[PDB]
Amino acid sequence: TPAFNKPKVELHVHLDGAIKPETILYFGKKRGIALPADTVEELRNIIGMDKPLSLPGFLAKFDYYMPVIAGCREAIKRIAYEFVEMKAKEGVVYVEVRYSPHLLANSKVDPMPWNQTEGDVTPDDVVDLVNQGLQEGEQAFGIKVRSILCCMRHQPSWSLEVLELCKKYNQKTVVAMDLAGDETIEGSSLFPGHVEAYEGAVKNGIHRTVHAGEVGSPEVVREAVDILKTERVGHGYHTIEDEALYNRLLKENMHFEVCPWSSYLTGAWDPKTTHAVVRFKNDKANYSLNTDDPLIFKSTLDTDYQMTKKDMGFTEEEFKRLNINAAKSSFLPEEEKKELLERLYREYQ
Ligand SMILES: [Zn+2]
């Protein structure tokens, strides 16, 4: 019995954290690359999580399976295509999906991700391949899909490259730049490479989101909003700790990309306390509901909706409100944004 059986919009979900276990198995076998399990259930049990850890302990799960996908053109295009199929079944009608193109490349990338041998798949090629799979998925499954490229906190030497790829692939299919990775790296938001990329984004009209206040202090959110000039905040739960900052962001209609089930499993949210999203809901904040890394969290979008419905008093009315806010805060051009809003209002009658 689905919590919200109406069209949804999802703004915060990682392509590399939203791959079918079956597809991971497939490419491990095909390429002869080690995976920590030989069945799909056992693979889910080791890659996946069902109790809280930490952000770095979460980030280690990628080490298990990224090597079977990175540097492989067929695999990269396939995960993009299967992503759209996955989301179409969830009742999502518009999604922005994000990833680090560098982390899927095996050429012209330093340091080389996942101990790969030099190949022929550059970060540029990665974006091209993802685009192809996403566009074919859109055609096959009849939902709209756009992508966001992630700078990685520990590797600000990639950030200007990420900016250039966002320019090169603007709206086809890249709609924004993100900053992801380990938020516990002290002061990483203001590493000069990241600041230069975001300032370049401002000058070139490239849209901006930033992971902030997931596990970091409100200062991380402040850094994102006031220096990186972010347009949306990934998570943002800890913003509430600085009341003045939080109230300012409410006043500015900042969008928070909320990931409730993710926040439980990464330890971003202390489950001894009321979730931040309850405050957001009560303050009528601008926010969306999102899966984040459904492969690792063993989840679908219904997991997050069920959780907020059961545990946080979420109504159908609030589910409609937050999806309309998600649509308004999307990085779609004006005409396509209007189209999405029209569709939501039509299907919500
Ligand atoms: Zn994320």
Swiss-Prot record:
GO CC, any one term: cytoplasmic vesicle lumen
Effect of H235A: Increases affinity for adenosine 20-fold. Reduces enzyme activity 500-fold
Effect of H235R: Reduces enzyme activity 1500-fold. No effect on affinity for adenosine
Membrane topology: Peripheral membrane protein
Keywords per UniProt: Acetylation, Cell adhesion, Cell junction, Cell membrane, Cytoplasm, Cytoplasmic vesicle, Hydrolase, Lysosome, Membrane, Metal-binding, Nucleotide metabolism, Zinc
Site (Important for catalytic activity): H235
CDD domains to which the protein is assigned, alphabetical: ADA (cd01320)
Residues annotated as signal peptide: none
Expression tissues: Detected in brain neurons in the median emninence (at protein level). Expressed in secondary deciduum (at protein level). Found in all tissues, occurs in large amounts in T-lymphocytes and, at the time of weaning, in gastrointestinal tissues.
pH dependence, entry free text: Optimum pH is 6-8.5.
Deletion phenotype: Lethal at perinatal stages. Fetuses are viable up to 18 dpc, but after this survival decreases rapidly. Fewer that 10% of mutant pups are born live, and these die within hours after birth. Mutant fetuses display much higher than normal levels of adenosine and dATP, respiratory distress, hepatocellular degeneration and necrosis. Prenatal lethality can be avoided using an ADA expression vector with a trophoblast-specific promoter. Mutant mice die after about three weeks due to immunodeficiency, disturbances in purine metabolism and severe lung inflammation.
Subcellular location: Cell membrane; Cell junction; Cytoplasmic vesicle lumen; Cytoplasm
Principal location listed in the UniProt entry: membrane
Cofactor(s), names only, from the UniProt record: Zn(2+)
Pfam families given in the database record: A_deaminase
Binding partners and assembly: Interacts with DPP4 (via extracellular domain). Interacts with PLG (via Kringle 4 domain); the interaction stimulates PLG activation when in complex with DPP4.
Official protein name in the record: Adenosine deaminase
